[PDB]
Design a protein around this ligand. Structure first.
Ligand SMILES: Nc1ccn([C@H]2C[C@H](O)[C@@H](COP(=O)(O)OP(=O)(O)OP(=O)(O)O)O2)c(=O)n1
Ligand SMILES: [Mg+2]
Lengths: 122, 328, 111, 111, 110, 111
RNA sequence: UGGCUCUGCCAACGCUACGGCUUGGCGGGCUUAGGUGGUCACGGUUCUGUCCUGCUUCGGCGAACACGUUACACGGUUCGGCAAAACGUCGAUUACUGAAAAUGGAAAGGCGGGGCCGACUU
RNA sequence: GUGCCCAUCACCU
RNA sequence: GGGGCAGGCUGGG
């Protein structure tokens, strides 16, 4: 059968994305819980959250470390969004527990991105 | 179930099964190249697999054979994710028509029976019966000596679906003498195979207090000369019929302890095995003088499960006194 | 050939997915807009690819296809309202796979 | 530039009415089509100043994408928005700006 | 200098933003894109001033050019009239003033 | 310098409440202001992952644009005006981030 | 999901090509599984302490401090009674049907306990 | 590599 | 003499 091959198979992009999918799967529900007001914040958060997948993916296929650092910047911005959604959003958006859970998941993707940046950097 | 079993390849390739097979194959493996290369076009992949199986054009990719020494010198042949999924999709339809014929007291790779339900069966069957003696036996090189041929005379009094039969025979050829270790398909067919000796214990031989866990077979008695007979009868059977040499056997009075399944099971206590302790003791000590006293809590929690069964109160006190760490 | 063929095969993806992607509820509106931008914007990735033959351009056509498959996974996962039924992901993945094949052959032809 | 944009203005003036006829239902497709249509002017303009051929090929890609949008709006959008005739007429106008873009590409890569 | 251009462009915005909010919902995408062109050119100027590459000073010119396009486009967009011809004339004067300053600035850098 | 982000995050904490406040009427300005405000974090972040002064000047441009947004949102008229106080009492916050950005630009410029 | 390229009405930031538009209210329309770990089925050599050096049914099992090798107390690892049924298994891919068991197809019976029913505990 | 258990983590019934 | 434990020293890692 031989599984339908994508071109430019990168382990690191595949792994990172599967692990980041867990971030999305955690955060997307709570990005959608952000009230109507805080809709622009939400749309921007969702574009950060769901759009980091593209950052990873493009990093994977176009092997250029620039794109890997862009992925890191995005993860950094996502970490900002957690801070923002917790603190600055006034109703609630993200319970302290949720930030603690999300940060763990993002940290896992952080690890993998770091390792990937490193293996490419050599 | 009426016997027969004549249309399993229809259920094996039901999409709803292959999706179960998929989720079972990927369970835990979701950071592997296999899952991640399959996950891409997962449902288009399963549609070409469903329809390879449903055609009879499935061909098992070669076993990638490595070997680890950390547990024991093994011979671990891995499979491609596609192949482990085909195996999981077989062993979802085919396993429960074998594992249902498996007598109660086989404790290996069958749901709701385990290592720990075995040691408990043994202890228990040791307490009741007031067993005076016991035969413990073991099969030489079990998987590497399974007929793959008189195996398919058992995979074949039960499958009766002549296409599941041909998928079984792709996933595991019907010629040779070596069921591959590191196949779901093979855990099953080894229990099934060693199920033949269970049915020369329980059926012929009328032995009602035994336990088999894959290749190890405890057989509590009361007359140690009878248990020696039983053993001779078992060995003669499993040699002439199954091509299994018995590596070690003994007929001990229940007093030496039945070194069964990681424990040493007297009627009354159930010390674990010194290896386990020493491995753990050393693991702990290492963890302490590695500054890894936080993964040690994970390990400790683990070993506190393997030892909650065993009479490891004194030993848990002892390990708490030596290092302080919360064992239980 | 190549760009023309890929795009005509990808048009089938769009023709399948655009309906699906227009059905995604407003609740999942950012996901939808981003999925539509992924789906209808992969055409630009192909177009740029066959206007250069820079093989990196056909790899970012692959990245786009990869992102599109992410969207399928994601849209099948979202369970608030709901979107892409599992069947739709299966059907779409087949079509995207066909575009994948052609992209692969094209990557190879350039190699 | 100036002449490309004045010729593309005719595309816009033909297509924008068509793009506004696309029903609410296909509103995201419309917004995306309009951002392709009205936003190609920026592509032309930015090439006009920063004459780098990179910027000029992006203009070509945009025209190509606009041609895709014609195909898409004629058929893949389910109430086929652009009638086949409209695609033919639009393609003539786009072709005129295509010609000028081509000549401009050629003028830039003279050496 | 960025400060001057921006203060003169603020007058464009202050003229056009009212007008660009009056563009009918029918022409809603054009409006939002025109507003994003209008308030949005400020960023183009600002980036040009807080750095320097002259490409940024061209991108500011491109933006002013696009803004001019938007005026001509919105003037006679359809039956729902967006921008009156007079408004385009008035706006074009203001944009021209910022155009002049941008031109001088491009020249001073060149 | 990541006190930058954490001193900017009080700009955000001051400005975001009143940016969510901007009515639908001023909706494009709002979206663009929010993208300026919340998106300056990315400008800082990119600056700090590179320490290239280009990215540091882009961060400055963003702060400058944010200052523009304050002055713009002031004279937006009606009961929706960013009150003169808030323009000044945010200009103070942005100025603090400005100072740190300046020092950071300088630290990099005189290596 | 602060929607709607969506209407009725009413106002007024405003803008009008004087038609409207916009914008604001105001109604209606459209809108358990998974993850991660970790158990069970790296040695080589001399040295220094330290301890063990039993058993065997001849297969092997041990031992050398888990030290009462045992929380010396049990886990529902309980105790009875059954084994009709269902389950398992042999009968059997048999009888039978039909050219052929061909992706039909039993049973009587035999064997189990895996099952059942109480008690007591869980 | 395969299964069985253990821990922990999310996550709703 | 052999053997188990914890440290010597050397590889695996
Ligand atoms: N890491 C392992 C170890 C064992 N097994 C399986 C296959 C084995 O055949 C079976 C029984 O385990 P044993 O420890 O008894 O090993 P063998 O059966 O190969 O015989 P022996 O122990 O005498 O060498 O468990 C496994 O899948 N993975
Ligand atoms: Mg063995």
């Amino acid at each position: 059968m031989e599984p339908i091959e994508e071109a430019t198979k990168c382990y690191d992009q595949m792994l990172i994305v599967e692990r980041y999918e867990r971030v999305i799967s955690y955060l997307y529900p709570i990005a959608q819980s952000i009230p109507r007001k805080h809709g622009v914040a939400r749309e921007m958060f969702l574009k950060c959250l769901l759009g980091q997948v593209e950052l990873f993916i493009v990093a994977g296929k176009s092997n250029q470390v620039s794109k890997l650092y862009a992925a890191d910047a995005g993860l950094a911005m996502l970490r900002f969004w957690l801070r923002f959604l917790a603190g600055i959003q006034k109703p609630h958006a993200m319970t302290p527990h949720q930030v603690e859970t999300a940060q763990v998941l993002i940290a896992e993707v952080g690890r993998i991105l770091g390792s990937w940046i490193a293996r490419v950097n050599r | 179930m009426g016997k027969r079993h004549r249309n399993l390849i229809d259920q094996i390739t039901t999409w709803e099964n292959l999706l179960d097979a998929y989720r079972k194959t990927s369970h835990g493996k979701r950071r592997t190249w296999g899952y991640l290369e399959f996950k891409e076009y997962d449902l288009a992949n399963l549609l070409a697999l469903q329809a390879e199986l449903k055609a009879g054009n499935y061909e098992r990719g070669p076993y990638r054979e490595f070997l680890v020494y950390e547990p024991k010198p093994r011979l671990i042949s891995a499979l491609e994710f596609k192949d482990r999924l085909v195996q999981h999709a077989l062993c979802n339809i085919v396993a429960p028509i074998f594992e249902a014929g498996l007598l109660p007291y086989t404790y290996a790779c069958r749901p709701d029976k385990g290592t720990h339900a075995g040691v408990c069966h043994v202890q228990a069957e040791l307490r009741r019966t007031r067993a005076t003696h016991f035969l413990k036996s073991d099969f030489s090189k079990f998987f590497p000596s399974i007929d793959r041929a008189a195996l398919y005379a058992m995979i074949d009094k039960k499958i009766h679906c002549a296409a599941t039969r041909r998928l079984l025979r792709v996933v595991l050829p019907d010629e040779g003498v070596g069921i591959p270790i590191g196949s779901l398909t093979s855990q099953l067919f080894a229990n099934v195979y060693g199920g033949a000796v269970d049915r020369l214990l329980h059926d012929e031989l009328k032995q009602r207090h035994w336990a088999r866990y894959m290749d190890d077979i405890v057989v509590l008695g009361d007359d140690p000369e009878e248990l020696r007979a039983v053993f001779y009868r078992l060995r003669d059977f499993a040699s002439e019929r199954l091509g299994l040499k018995i590596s070690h056997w003994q007929v001990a009075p229940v007093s030496r302890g039945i070194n069964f399944l990681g424990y040493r099971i007297w009627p009354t206590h159930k010390l674990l095995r010194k290896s386990s302790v020493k491995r753990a003791k050393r693991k702990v000590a290492n963890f302490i003088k590695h500054g890894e006293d936080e993964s040690l809590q994970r390990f400790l929690a683990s070993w506190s499960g393997h030892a909650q069964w065993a009479d490891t109160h004194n030993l848990f006190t002892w390990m708490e006194e030596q290092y302080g760490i919360a064992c239980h």
